[PDB]
Amino acid sequence: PPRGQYSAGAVAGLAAVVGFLIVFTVVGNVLVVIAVLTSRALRAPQNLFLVSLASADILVATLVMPFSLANELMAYWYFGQWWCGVYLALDVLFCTSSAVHLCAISLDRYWSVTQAVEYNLKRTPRRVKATIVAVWLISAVISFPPLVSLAAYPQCGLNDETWYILSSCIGSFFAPCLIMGLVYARIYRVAKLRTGIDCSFWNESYLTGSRDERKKSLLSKFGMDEGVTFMFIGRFDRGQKGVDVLLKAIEILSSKKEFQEMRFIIIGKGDPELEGWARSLEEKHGNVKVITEMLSREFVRELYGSVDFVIIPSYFEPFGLVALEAMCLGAIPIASAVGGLRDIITNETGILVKAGDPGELANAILKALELSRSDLSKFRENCKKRAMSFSVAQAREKRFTFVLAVVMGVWVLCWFPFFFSYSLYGICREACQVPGPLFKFFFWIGYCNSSLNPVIYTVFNQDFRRSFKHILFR
Amino acid sequence: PPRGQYSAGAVAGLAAVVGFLIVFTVVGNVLVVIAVLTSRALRAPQNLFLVSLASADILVATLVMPFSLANELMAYWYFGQWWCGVYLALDVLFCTSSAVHLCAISLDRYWSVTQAVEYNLKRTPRRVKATIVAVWLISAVISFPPLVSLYRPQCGLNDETWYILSSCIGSFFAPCLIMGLVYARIYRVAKLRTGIDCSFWNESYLTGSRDERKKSLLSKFGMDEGVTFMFIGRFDRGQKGVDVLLKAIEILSSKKEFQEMRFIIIGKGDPELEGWARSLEEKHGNVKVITEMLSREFVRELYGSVDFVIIPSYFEPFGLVALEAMCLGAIPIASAVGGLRDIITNETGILVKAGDPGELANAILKALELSRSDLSKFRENCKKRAMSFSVAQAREKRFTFVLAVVMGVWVLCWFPFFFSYSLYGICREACQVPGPLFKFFFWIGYCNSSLNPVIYTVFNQDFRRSFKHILF
Numbered sequence: 026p027p028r029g030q031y032s033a034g035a036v037a038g039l040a041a042v043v044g045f046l047i048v049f050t051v052v053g054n055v056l057v058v059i060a061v062l063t064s065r066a067l068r069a070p071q072n073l074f075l076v077s078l079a080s081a082d083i084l085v086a087t088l089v090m091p092f093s094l095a096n097e098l099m100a101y102w103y104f105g106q107w108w109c110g111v112y113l114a115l116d117v118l119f120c121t122s123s124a125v126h127l128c129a130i131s132l133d134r135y136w137s138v139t140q141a142v143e144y145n146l147k148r149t150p151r152r153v154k155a156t157i158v159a160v161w162l163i164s165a166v167i168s169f170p171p172l173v174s175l176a177a178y179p180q181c182g183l184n185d186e187t188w189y190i191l192s193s194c195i196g197s198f199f200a201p202c203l204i205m206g207l208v209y210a211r212i213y214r215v216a217k218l219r220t221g222i223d224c225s226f227w228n229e230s231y232l233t234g235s236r237d238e239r240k241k242s243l244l245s246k247f248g249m250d251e252g253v254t255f256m257f258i259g260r261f262d263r264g265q266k267g268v269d270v271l272l273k274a275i276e277i278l279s280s281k282k283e284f285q286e287m288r289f290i291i292i293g294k295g296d297p298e299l300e301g302w303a304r305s306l307e308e309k310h311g312n313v314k315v316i317t318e319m320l321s322r323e324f325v326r327e328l329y330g331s332v333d334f335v336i337i338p339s340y341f342e343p344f345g346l347v348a349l350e351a352m353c354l355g356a357i358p359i360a361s362a363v364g365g366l367r368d369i370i371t372n373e374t375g376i377l378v379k380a381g382d383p384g385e386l387a388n389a390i391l392k393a394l395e396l397s398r399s400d401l402s403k404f405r406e407n408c409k410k411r412a413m414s415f416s417v418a419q420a421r422e423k424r425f426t427f428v429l430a431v432v433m434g435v436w437v438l439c440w441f442p443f444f445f446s447y448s449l450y451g452i453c454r455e456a457c458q459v460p461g462p463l464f465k466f467f468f469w470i471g472y473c474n475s476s477l478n479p480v481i482y483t484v485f486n487q488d489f490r491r492s493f494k495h496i497l498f499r
Numbered sequence: 500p501p502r503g504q505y506s507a508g509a510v511a512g513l514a515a516v517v518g519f520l521i522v523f524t525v526v527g528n529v530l531v532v533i534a535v536l537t538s539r540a541l542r543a544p545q546n547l548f549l550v551s552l553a554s555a556d557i558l559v560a561t562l563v564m565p566f567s568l569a570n571e572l573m574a575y576w577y578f579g580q581w582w583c584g585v586y587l588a589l590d591v592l593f594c595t596s597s598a599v600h601l602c603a604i605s606l607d608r609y610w611s612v613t614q615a616v617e618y619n620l621k622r623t624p625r626r627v628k629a630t631i632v633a634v635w636l637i638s639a640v641i642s643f644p645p646l647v648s649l650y651r652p653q654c655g656l657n658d659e660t661w662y663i664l665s666s667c668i669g670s671f672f673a674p675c676l677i678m679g680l681v682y683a684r685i686y687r688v689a690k691l692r693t694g695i696d697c698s699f700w701n702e703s704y705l706t707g708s709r710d711e712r713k714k715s716l717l718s719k720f721g722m723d724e725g726v727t728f729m730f731i732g733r734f735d736r737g738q739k740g741v742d743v744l745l746k747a748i749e750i751l752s753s754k755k756e757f758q759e760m761r762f763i764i765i766g767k768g769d770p771e772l773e774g775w776a777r778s779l780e781e782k783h784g785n786v787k788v789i790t791e792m793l794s795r796e797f798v799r800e801l802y803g804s805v806d807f808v809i810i811p812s813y814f815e816p817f818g819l820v821a822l823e824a825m826c827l828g829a830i831p832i833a834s835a836v837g838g839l840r841d842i843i844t845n846e847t848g849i850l851v852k853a854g855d856p857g858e859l860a861n862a863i864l865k866a867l868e869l870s871r872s873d874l875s876k877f878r879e880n881c882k883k884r885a886m887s888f889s890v891a892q893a894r895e896k897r898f899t900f901v902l903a904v905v906m907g908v909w910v911l912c913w914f915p916f917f918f919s920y921s922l923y924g925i926c927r928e929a930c931q932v933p934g935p936l937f938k939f940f941f942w943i944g945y946c947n948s949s950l951n952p953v954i955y956t957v958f959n960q961d962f963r964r965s966f967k968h969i970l971f
């Protein structure tokens with residue numbers, strides 16, 4: 026028998042902490058599976074990647090972690106040649122699937138914010154099951170289990186070839202880290218530009234005045250009569266916010282007999298040529314109130330809770346905050362079916378015109394007038410309800426994405442010492458070999474990562490916290 | 500005579516990573532020093548501890564860290580017997596001073612939490628600078644044994660079984676016990692929720708004109724416009740002081756000035772005062788007694804429509820009603836008791852004496868005198884004084900949190916080594932963690948010196964804003 030490097034005390038001690046770890050990883054991750062499959066707030070199809078990731082951790086804990094310790098403590102591989110090959114393939118496989126899982130999850134967070142409309146109709150359990158199958162096959166192809174292995178008292182070790190060490194470090198850690206970084210870099214640019222609405226500020230917290238009363242007060246303050254009001258804010262530009270589409274549509278409306286029934290409040294100081302076209306229409310028509318001034322947030326909220334409709338005629342609008350904050354106060358949007366406006370507005374919450382054509386806009390303003398004569402009271406409440414529901418949906422999804430970045434960062438920091446050390450040995454071998462005891466500790470920090478995701482979810486997410494509390498405490 | 504384990508390449512790579520780490524630790528912690536000694540957000544005296552703790556971590560990077568690595572790579576102590584004793588003495592002192600600093604900070608937050616106002620005036624820069632020396636001295640009485648025990652060409656530390664075990668308890672486990680127990684008391688008073696929800700109680704969240712809001716409110720009650728006074732809370736003799744207001748209304752009702760005034764009194768509980776209020780509501784179609792539980796949003800609307808908020812409290816330690824009322828624009832008429840006397844000044848509101856209805860009726864009659872002219876400046880003084888209190892509490896709330904993280908991170912960094920060193924003292928080669936792993940463990944320890952400026956950037960907005968102001 027080979028002399029062991031571990032005393033009885035060290036064996037009992039190490040088997041106890043690792044024993045503790047295995048149990049902690051299993052119950053925690055089993056609880057994650059349970060939370061996703063039971064919690065209403067967590068039963069979304071994209072959350073199945075977390076179920077699949079939890080299993081990768083449950084199986085390192087049961088199929089790999091005990092043999093890593095037993096092999097260490099014993100100074101030899103006792104479990105036979107067959108289980109050596111299966112143990113080595115899995116160890117690499119389960120490590121590799123966490124890497125590929127974090128790439129799949131990252132992309133899913135990226136496309137949900139960017140391609141919100143198109144992507145979410147593809148966020149189906151069957152489609153998610155297809156991607157989880159794909160991550161597992163990519164993890165098997167990357168891991169390539171058929172050749173990982175290779176004796177008086179036998180040993181169980183990996184292939185020592187240079188091309189292999191490096192191929193496997195890149196495929197299983199360095200390239201998945203490059204993908205995750207790049208995707209999360211693209212997520213934090215979008216998250217910075219598509220900032221969430223001031224939920225508390227954009228609300229009719231007056232609970233004092235009436236809609237028709239606020240409208241009459243507003244239209245008297247500007248210098249008009251009581252009628253169907255239309256309103257524009259934002260930069261005066263042909264390239265994006267599309268003020269030109271509205272000014273041209275008003276020129277089409279002026280030639281009509283229904284122009285007298287309509288009131289228009291245009292705002293912006295973007296283009297000198299467009300400002301002139303705007304104020305010339307204010308000079309030519311008394312139904313037009315052009316305000317080139319910079320109106321404070323306090324003034325625009327007063328405007329939204331008075332005007333019947335808000336015209337958002339953008340060529341490109343990735344978020345459409347103006348639509349959301351306007352809908353919260355009761356203004357019915359008339360927007361171009363572009364980017365973020367296509368996502369927010371429904372049949373019950375507004376009118377979606379085609380971007381660029383003023384004839385498309387003018388015809389909608391006429392349709393708006395036809396709807397105005399009847400009970401607009403219930404149509405305005407669908408706008409208020411949608412704006413809140415969409416905003417709270419996006420705030421909580423923006424939060425879930427952050428938690429998932431924490432999951433990704435903690436994984437990268439847990440495996441970096443090992444992969445950095447294993448890569449160096451692949452390169453300079455002996456001249457840069459991390460000592461045996463440090464190398465061993467480095468892949469144990471790696472194994473410890475399997476127990477961490479359930480702590481991250483608990484700490485950073487209320488829905489997993491509540492699910493865990495409901496199971497654990499009654 | 501002996502040659503190192505480290506090849507020419509390793510030496511170069513290791514010197515570059517320790518080299519980088521030393522530079523990172525120095526610039527980062529130097530940035531913490533400048534941040535506390537320049538930013539008005541960090542001009543609170545308690546922050547000076549983080550300048551002394553930044554100084555500790557700079558000295559680690561500069562005076563001990565190059566020698567730890569130099570000694571390692573070289574396989575012996577090249578620098579001589581005198582620098583061996585100073586290097587070892589300092590290396591232990593900077594580790595203990597970090598543990599003791601985190602006992603001084605932990606205990607500072609505890610007195611901040613326990614004795615709220617009396618031991619807040621005590622926190623002075625000259626008082627804190629004395630604690631910084633107290634902690635630096637205590638650190639020496641721990642690092643360098645009072646038993647005038649020796650620390651021990653190699654450069655080893657004293658190997659005696661009892662120096663090993665007493666030193667781990669003194670520099671790590673005892674300060675880890677203090678930190679934990681003190682923060683156990685801290686998070687026990689954190690559940691009080693004594694913080695003003697400024698993310699809600701803000702007149703910015705209200706829409707329309709305040710005059711138009713006060714008109715519509717009175718219109719809902721079917722009342723004519725006039726100087727609207729409000730009382731909020733429960734109906735009881737003591738704490739709230741409903742009995743001081745109902746009796747104060749009786750002095751005013753017997754005067755031609757009551758005509759002008761309007762009352763929105765909100766109380767629930769015992770029918771003794773409730774019957775007295777309802778009778779005054781039946782007697783005067785000018786007073787409106789509300790008993791039912793009112794929504795958090797409707798109170799925000801009342802604070803932002805009514806002219807004055809009456810707080811006739813006998814005992815009021817915090818005075819949140821006043822802070823919530825002030826943040827909405829309402830001018831308070833409150834008794835100068837506990838917290839109210841600490842919030843309301845001469846320019847913000849009207850302070851009185853608890854228990855006298857004649858003094859409160861006189862204050863209500865002074866409120867009516869004031870309302871006849873523009874009150875807008877008083878309200879702008881009300882919001883200004885109350886929001887400065889909410890930011891002072893939030894700055895204290897964050898600071899206590901960011902420092903639970905610093906302490907938590909320090910323990911995780913030193914636990915591997917201090918547990919390893921302790922085990923060794925007990926069972927020696929029977930539980931000796933391997934040479935390389937033991938050496939890495941104290942380098943995890945040395946890495947903690949660069950982490951603190953990263954912890955502040957991430958978790959404290961004031962330091963993040965300060966570091967952006969220095970570096971751009």
Ligand SMILES: CC(C)CCC[C@@H](C)[C@H]1CC[C@H]2[C@@H]3CC=C4C[C@@H](O)CC[C@]4(C)[C@H]3CC[C@]12C
Nearest residue numbers: 039042043046049462465466469470473476933
């Ligand atoms: C839930 C988590 C955070 C628990 C953490 C358990 C940690 C402390 C345990 C789990 C497995 C352990 C390792 C198992 C094997 C070895 C090899 C031996 O030659 C030195 C100790 C070392 C390197 C152990 C160090 C401590 C270790 C990493």
Ligand SMILES: CC(C)CCC[C@@H](C)[C@H]1CC[C@H]2[C@@H]3CC=C4C[C@@H](O)CC[C@]4(C)[C@H]3CC[C@]12C
Nearest residue numbers: 460463516517520523935938939942943946949
């Ligand atoms: C910017 C900061 C946070 C980077 C952190 C620096 C880390 C990675 C550095 C600092 C000092 C280094 C250690 C110095 C000494 C030894 C002992 C040797 O037998 C193995 C390598 C080992 C254990 C090094 C590993 C890496 C190390 C711990």
Ligand SMILES: CCS(=O)(=O)N1CCC[C@@H]2CN3CCc4cc(OC)ccc4[C@H]3C[C@@H]21
Nearest residue numbers: 093116117120168182183193194197468471
């Ligand atoms: C001490 C022998 S050993 O150092 O050779 N060894 C076999 C036992 C487990 C240990 C850690 N795990 C984590 C994942 C993983 C991923 C890889 O990328 C493909 C490559 C190896 C490792 C393995 C293998 C390690």
Ligand SMILES: CCS(=O)(=O)N1CCC[C@@H]2CN3CCc4cc(OC)ccc4[C@H]3C[C@@H]21
Nearest residue numbers: 567590591594642655656666667670941944
């Ligand atoms: C392997 C040599 S050694 O093990 O003997 N050694 C000398 C070099 C530094 C190393 C780490 N530092 C951190 C602070 C520190 C605090 C203590 O608590 C009082 C006790 C020792 C340590 C030292 C000493 C270590």
Ligand SMILES: CCCCCCCC/C=C\CCCCCCCC(=O)O
Nearest residue numbers: 033034035037038039042918922930
């Ligand atoms: C006073 C410290 C508190 C101890 C409990 C927490 C320790 C858990 C972390 C690492 C332990 C690793 C196992 C090392 C012990 C081996 C047993 C032995 O020494 O004989």
Ligand SMILES: CCCCCCCC/C=C\CCCCCCCC(=O)O
Nearest residue numbers: 442445446457458459505509943946
């Ligand atoms: C907070 C502590 C930081 C922990 C991160 C660990 C990352 C270090 C990883 C690998 C170290 C590489 C050193 C290789 C040179 C040593 C070779 C030799 O001993 O001859």
